[PDB]
Amino acid sequence: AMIISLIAALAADRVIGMENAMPWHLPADLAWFKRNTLNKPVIMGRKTFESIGRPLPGRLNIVISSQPGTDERVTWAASIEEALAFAGNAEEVMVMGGGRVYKQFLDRANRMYLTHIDAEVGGDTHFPDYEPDEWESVFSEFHDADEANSHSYCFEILERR
Numbered sequence: 001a002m003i004i005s006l007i008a009a010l011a012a013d014r015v016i017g018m019e020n021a022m023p024w025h026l027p028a029d030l031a032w033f034k035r036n037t038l039n040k041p042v043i044m045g046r047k048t049f050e051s052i053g054r055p056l057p058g059r060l061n062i063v064i065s066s067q068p069g070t071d072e073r074v075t076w077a078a079s080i081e082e083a084l085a086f087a088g089n090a091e092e093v094m095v096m097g098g099g100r101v102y103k104q105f106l107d108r109a110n111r112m113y114l115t116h117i118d119a120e121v122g123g124d125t126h127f128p129d130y131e132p133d134e135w136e137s138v139f140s141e142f143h144d145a146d147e148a149n150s151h152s153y154c155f156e157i158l159e160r161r
């Protein structure tokens with residue numbers, strides 16, 4: 001049973017994106033992202049791959065795009081079907097956005113790695129609205145802002161009932 005997992009950073013009001021990059025500086029979230037995606041296939045949309053600016057080391061990078069990719073260092077998938085097939089027989093595949101990709105994988109996903117950030121950023125792209133009754137929280141860890149992280153943040157792992 002392949003576990004499909006969504007991993008996302010959510011500001012206030014479920015905001016995940018806006019026109020430009022999110023206005024926060026959270027190296028601790030990037031370290032949590034890295035820890036939870038290493039040695040796993042990682043599925044992302046082409047815009048998210050451009051946001052990163054490079055391949056993610058130590059993991060299988062699967063970028064979904066309708067147009068042919070122009071970077072041989074990652075795996076290019078024309079559809080979510082091709083993306084999942086590229087993940088092979090991995091026990092957990094990580095879906096890291098963006099907004100459209102989250103909507104397409106939500107029904108297939110049985111686990112979520114959510115970072116809740118205490119920032120009212122006023123964005124207009126939101127994480128999909130999921131039913132809270134169908135998910136249960138199995139991990140929770142809170143951190144305050146500090147000299148290195150611009151906002152307080154709460155790591156959470158949810159699993160489908």
Ligand SMILES: CN(Cc1cnc2nc(N)nc(N)c2n1)c1ccc(C(=O)N[C@@H](CCC(=O)O)C(=O)O)cc1
Pocket residue numbers: 007008009029030031033034048051052056057095096097113114115
């Ligand atoms: C813009 N972007 C998308 C991004 C950012 N934060 C997230 N945070 C969470 N929780 N989930 C996501 N899907 C997510 N996606 C990025 C940008 C940089 C790196 C990155 O380089 N991360 C390094 C670690 C950070 C570093 O090396 O400086 C890695 O090895 O994964 C990842 C995602």
Ligand SMILES: [Ca+2]
Pocket residue numbers: 017018019020021
């Ligand atoms: Ca954006």
Ligand SMILES: [K+]
Pocket residue numbers: 072073074
């Ligand atoms: K290659």
